[PDB]
Amino acid sequence: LKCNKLVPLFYKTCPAGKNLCYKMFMVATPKVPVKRGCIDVCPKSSLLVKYVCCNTDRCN
Numbered sequence: 001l002k003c004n005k006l007v008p009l010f011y012k013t014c015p016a017g018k019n020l021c022y023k024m025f026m027v028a029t030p031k032v033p034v035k036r037g038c039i040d041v042c043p044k045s046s047l048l049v050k051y052v053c054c055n056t057d058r059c060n
C-alpha cells in the first residue's frame with residue numbers, strides 16, 4: 001500500500017501491519033490537512049479533530 005505524505009506530491013510505502021492511509025484535519029478548517037500517511041487503525045474522530053481513512057494507493 002502507498003500513501004501520500006503531508007505534501008501529496010510525495011508518498012511512501014507502508015510497513016507491514018499498516019493497511020490504511022489517512023488524512024487528519026481540524027474540524028473548522030477541513031481543507032488544510034495537517035497530517036497524512038500510513039496507519040493501522042483509523043483514529044477516533046473527535047469534536048475538533050477529524051480523520052479520513054482509506055485503503056487504496058495514495059487515496060489520502
Ligand SMILES: CCCCCCCCCCCCC/C=C/[C@@H](O)[C@H](CO[C@@H]1O[C@H](CO)[C@H](O)[C@H](OS(=O)(=O)O)[C@H]1O)NC(=O)[C@H](O)CCCCCCCCCCCCCCCCCCCCCC
Nearest residue numbers: 004005006012013014015016017018035036037038039040
Ligand atoms: C535491513 C535494512 C534494509 C531493508 C530493506 C530496504 C528498505 C527499508 C525500508 C525501511 C522503512 C520501512 C518502515 C517505514 C515506516 C514508516 O514509513 C511508517 C510511517 O507511517 C506514517 O507516516 C506518517 C507521515 O507521512 C506519520 O508519521 C504517521 O505517524 S503516526 O502518528 O501514525 O505514528 C506514520 O504512522 N510507519 C512508521 O514509521 C511506524 O513507526 C511503523 C511502526 C509499525 C511497523 C513495525 C512493527 C510491525 C509489527 C512487527 C510484528 C512482528 C512480525 C514482523 C514481520 C515483518 C518482518 C520484516 C520487517 C518489517 C519492518 C517494518 C518496518
Ligand SMILES: CCCCCCCCCCOCCOCCOCCOCCOCCOCCO
Nearest residue numbers: 002004005006007008009010011012013014036
Ligand atoms: C517519492 C516516492 C517514495 C517511495 C519510497 C517510500 C519511502 C520513502 C523513504 C524516504 O525517502 C528516501 C529517499 O530520500 C532520502 C532521504 O530519506 C529521508 C527522508 O526524510 C523525509 C523528508 O523527505 C520528505 C519530504 O516531504 C515531507 C512530507 O511532505
Ligand SMILES: CCCCCCCCCCOCCOCCOCCOCCOCCOCCO
Nearest residue numbers: 025026027042043044045046047048049050051
Ligand atoms: C476552559 C473552560 C473549561 C470549562 C470546564 C467546565 C465545563 C465543561 C462543560 C462541557 O463538558 C462537556 C463534556 O466534556 C467531556 C470531556 O470532553 C471530551 C470531549 O471529546 C470530544 C470528542 O468526543 C466526541 C464523542 O466521542 C465519542 C467516542 O468516539
